[PDB]
Amino acid sequence: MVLSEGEWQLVLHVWAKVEADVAGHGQDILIRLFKSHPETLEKFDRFKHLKTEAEMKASEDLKKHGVTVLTGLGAILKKKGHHEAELKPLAQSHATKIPIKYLEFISEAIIHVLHSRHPGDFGADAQGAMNKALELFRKDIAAKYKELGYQG
Numbered sequence: 001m002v003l004s005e006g007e008w009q010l011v012l013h014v015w016a017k018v019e020a021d022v023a024g025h026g027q028d029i030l031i032r033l034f035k036s037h038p039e040t041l042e043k044f045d046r047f048k049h050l051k052t053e054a055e056m057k058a059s060e061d062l063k064k065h066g067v068t069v070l071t072g073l074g075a076i077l078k079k080k081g082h083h084e085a086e087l088k089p090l091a092q093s094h095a096t097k098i099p100i101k102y103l104e105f106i107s108e109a110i111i112h113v114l115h116s117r118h119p120g121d122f123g124a125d126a127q128g129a130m131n132k133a134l135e136l137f138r139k140d141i142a143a144k145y146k147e148l149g150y151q152g
C-alpha cells in the first residue's frame with residue numbers, strides 16, 4: 001500500500017480535527033465499535049459489563065482507552081507509513097489477542113465517526129485516503145503479529 005503526500009495530508013488534516021476533542025472522538029469510536037460488534041467489548045475486563053450508551057459515556061475506563069487509542073494511532077498516521085517503531089510496541093499489547101478482524105471493525109468505526117463529525121471536509125477523497133492508511137496499518141501490524149507467532 002502506498003499513499004501520495006497529498007493523500008497523507010488529507011489524513012493529517014482530518015486528524016487535526018480529531019485532536020481538538022480526542023476524548024470525545026474516542027468515546028464515539030469505541031461506543032460505535034462495541035455496539036456494532038459486542039464481542040469486542042469482552043476484551044476489556046475493566047468495563048465489559050457496560051451496556052447502555054449512557055453507561056459507556058460515563059465510563060472513565062472507556063474514555064481513557066479511547067484517548068490511548070487515538071493518541072497512539074495519531075502518532076502512527078503522522079509517520080506517513082514509516083511506523084515500524086510505533087507498531088512494534090502495539091503488536092506487543094495486541095498479540096501477547098486482538099485479531100485482524102477486530103482491527104477492521106475499529107477501522108470501520110473510525111471512518112464512520114469521522115464522517116459523522118466532519119462531513120463538510122471528510123469526503124470520498126479523505127475517506128479513501130484514511131481507508132488506505134488504516135489498511136496499511138492493519139497489514140503491517142499483522143506482520144508484527146506473525147513475528148510473535150500470532151496469525152491474528
Ligand SMILES: Cc1cccc(/C=N/c2ccccc2/N=C/c2cccc(C)c2O)c1O
Pocket residue numbers: 040041043044068069070072073090093094098102103106
Ligand atoms: C487501533 C489501536 C491504535 C492504537 C492503540 C491501540 C491499543 N490497543 C490496546 C492497548 C492495550 C491493550 C489492549 C488494546 N486493544 C484492545 C482491543 C480490544 C478489542 C478490539 C480492538 C480493536 C482492540 O484494539 C489500538 O487498538
Ligand SMILES: [Cr+3]
Pocket residue numbers: 094098
Ligand atoms: Cr487496541
